[PDB]
Each structure stands twice: as structure tokens, then as C-alpha cells.
Amino acid sequence: DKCKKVYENYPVSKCQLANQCNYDCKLDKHARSGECFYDEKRNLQCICDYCEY
Known part of the structure; x- marks a missing residue:
């Protein structure tokens, strides 16, 4: 979360x-x-990561 x-x-x-x-x-x-991850909308959600992942 904090890194996402x-x-x-x-x-x-x-x-x-x-x-x-x-x-x-x-x-x-x-x-x-x-x-990027797949959500329920079948769309690619861009999740910026800071170091942790």
C-alpha cells in the first residue's frame, strides 16, 4: 500500500x-x-511500486 x-x-x-x-x-x-495487474473490469490497472513489490 505505502509502496503501492x-x-x-x-x-x-x-x-x-x-x-x-x-x-x-x-x-x-x-x-x-x-x-500492472488485472482487475475485475478485466482492465490493466497501473500500480506504481516504490522499491517494495
């Missing part, structure tokens, strides 16, 4: 690529590893 931050304002099919997630997040949310 969900950005529902940035779920993109492009995120389907664990590569785009961290790269794009770094550019947008400055996330360290930008990790």
Missing part, C-alpha cells in the same frame, strides 16, 4: 506489456518498476 499506488487514470491496453508499464509509468507516474 494505483493509477486508475492510466489503464491502457498498451500496458499489457510489462515493458510499457514500467517505462510508461516512469515517464508518467515516475514509478520505479510500474507494475
Whole structure:
């Protein structure tokens, strides 16, 4: 939680690529590893991680 931050304002099919997630997040949310997960909406939620993951 403290090291995790969900950005529902940035779920993109492009995120389907664990590569785009961290790269794009770094550019947008400055996330360290930008990790995306699948929610109930079957959408890719961009969860910025800080060190812990």
C-alpha cells in the first residue's frame, strides 16, 4: 500500500506489456518498476511500486 499506488487514470491496453508499464509509468507516474495487474473490469490497472513489490 505505502509502496503501492494505483493509477486508475492510466489503464491502457498498451500496458499489457510489462515493458510499457514500467517505462510508461516512469515517464508518467515516475514509478520505479510500474507494475500492472488485472482487475475485475478485466482492465490493466497501473500500480506504481516504490522499491517494495
